[PDB]
Design a protein around this ligand. Sequence first.
Ligand SMILES: NC(=O)c1ccc[n+]([C@@H]2O[C@H](COP(=O)([O-])OP(=O)(O)OC[C@H]3O[C@@H](n4cnc5c(N)ncnc54)[C@H](OP(=O)(O)O)[C@@H]3O)[C@@H](O)[C@H]2O)c1
Ligand SMILES: Cc1cc2nc3c(=O)[nH]c(=O)nc-3n(C[C@H](O)[C@H](O)[C@H](O)COP(=O)(O)O)c2cc1C
Lengths: 161, 168
Amino acid sequence: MDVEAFYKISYGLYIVTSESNGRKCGQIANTVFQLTSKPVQIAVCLNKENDTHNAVKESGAFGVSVLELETPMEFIGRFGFRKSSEFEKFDGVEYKTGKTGVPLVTQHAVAVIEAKVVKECDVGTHTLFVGEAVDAEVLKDAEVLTYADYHLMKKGKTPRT
Amino acid sequence: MDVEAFYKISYGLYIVTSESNGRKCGQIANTVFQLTSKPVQIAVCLNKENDTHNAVKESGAFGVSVLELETPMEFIGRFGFRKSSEFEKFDGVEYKTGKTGVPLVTQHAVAVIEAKVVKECDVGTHTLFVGEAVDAEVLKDAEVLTYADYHLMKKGKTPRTATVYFES
Ligand SMILES: NC(=O)c1ccc[n+]([C@@H]2O[C@H](COP(=O)([O-])OP(=O)(O)OC[C@H]3O[C@@H](n4cnc5c(N)ncnc54)[C@H](OP(=O)(O)O)[C@@H]3O)[C@@H](O)[C@H]2O)c1
Ligand SMILES: Cc1cc2nc3c(=O)[nH]c(=O)nc-3n(C[C@H](O)[C@H](O)[C@H](O)COP(=O)(O)O)c2cc1C
């Protein structure tokens, strides 16, 4: 089995957020997808080792920020290469509080979505949370960043509108 | 709540296949994603009213063909009918059969993945099938077709994969 075949699967790039016990958590995730339309349900798959996973497990709510094409790599690293409980990821970033109580990061976001968890599907190393959308807003007219784009950025390439 | 925000989520375009009661089934789908790496697990979300949904639930296996950017619309159309015979879907289509028994469509595919269902997550109108990948292969050196590209091209417009430029 050639693991490189899985590189061919397409994804967006997002920040998945939640808050539990006054602790704001956020992580980068590429595994975010809409599952149904009646009602609108969005799934996020988070590693059980993540602080954001535990915040979602406890609070039963999560936010999703869809990242824009021009999101800086340091912003991606702020959320994707350290733990929320060990580094204040939200200090220095613009965000607001959703109707569910989750922090919705507006900085570099084309849109934000907040959802309440209605089902958890354990898949081993990760938990697939199924959330029913409670609110969603489009914030910018910018192009979205894809996971494939991010891999081109990793190679030193930079987006040019 | 602005529904347009949900259209900002990215997806690929795939043919999800299965075989049940000696009949090959296939359906276009955009909701296919890798859940885990240890072991590799792939999720596919299918509407309960689709024949492929039932084929996967019965057989416990599925295949995924990742479509190339240049896939003709007529080919995609073969796998998008609510009701169509096996011959209507597969006649003249290049495919091979994996150890799980599912037909792996290789035509217009950049890669194919074969999986055995290990868990089902019922989400109401759809079932999210969690499959443990048993095989996977890269077949071509071509760009993938994203769901957004598909929608653009369908309307005779240039793909995003062509409107965005990366500077080395
Ligand atoms: N939990 C999840 O669903 C999930 C999904 C993705 C990543 N992650 C985690 O996120 C962090 C950063 O991951 P990452 O995305 O930077 O990579 P990574 O998963 O750590 O991949 C390591 C290397 O594999 C190659 N590679 C992997 N995926 C590729 C792709 N889609 N396209 C092209 N090359 C690919 C590249 O090799 P070369 O650079 O040598 O070409 C890349 O540097 C890591 O801690 C990783 O474990 C978690
Ligand atoms: C490009 C990229 C994509 C990622 N995708 C996911 C994902 O889909 N699911 C996941 O659980 N972690 C994913 N991660 C890893 C988390 O963002 C990372 O482990 C983060 O440090 C977790 O933070 P937390 O402990 O504060 O939740 C990704 C990281 C990067 C850089």
